[PDB]
Amino acid sequence: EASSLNEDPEGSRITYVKGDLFACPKTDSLAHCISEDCRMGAGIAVLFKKKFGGVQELLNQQKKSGEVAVLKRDGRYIYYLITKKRASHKPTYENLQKSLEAMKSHCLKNGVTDLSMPRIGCGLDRLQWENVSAMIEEVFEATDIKITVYTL
């Protein structure tokens, strides 16, 4: 009986958690950014690669950059924000903004109010998180969904 759960929100839309992204609470659905081409050679998608192995599930939906591909297992929905076309494509605010719109509106249809995502975007400071965090809240306005960001 040793289970240290990190249920620690309440502050703003976004709450930052340092820890494992898969150690997220069962009530929380999970989101992150991927390419529409879904070639996963890097990113947190490679972790989902072993965990859910739903690359084809995504591609069979055929989403474009600006849309979100969702995987339902049970309890939580996995949000694959299609942020960029090719895998080496780098996220844009508007593309990410669109994936957030898609994602946030979907949560309403399912009754999702808890979401967890890692360091979304890509390994570039070209997008400034200050704009990202604001944009998330700007998109999320009028929702009741929490945002839990795991830092990596």
UniProtKB/Swiss-Prot annotation:
PROSITE patterns: MACRO. Changing G123E: Abolishes enzyme activity. Its EC number is 3.5.1.-, 3.2.2.-. One of its GO terms (molecular function) is O-acetyl-ADP-ribose deacetylase activity. Substrate binds at L21, R119, I120, G121, C122, G123, L124, D125, L152. Keywords: Acetylation, Chromosome, Disease variant, Hydrolase, Nucleus, Phosphoprotein. One of its GO terms (cellular component) is nucleoplasm. It is an enzyme of class 3 (hydrolase). The active site is at K84 (nucleophile), D125 (proton acceptor). It is found in: Nucleus, Nucleoplasm; Nucleus, Nucleolus; Chromosome. InterPro entries: ADP-ribose_metab_enzymes, Macro_dom, Macro_dom-like. Its main location: nucleus. One of its GO terms (biological process) is DNA damage response. The modification Phosphoserine is found at S4. It is linked to Defects in OARD1 are found in patients with severe neurodegeneration. Defects were found in an extended consanguineous family with several affected cases in two generations. This is ADP-ribose glycohydrolase OARD1. It comes from Homo sapiens. The lineage of its organism: Eukaryota, Metazoa, Chordata, Craniata, Vertebrata.
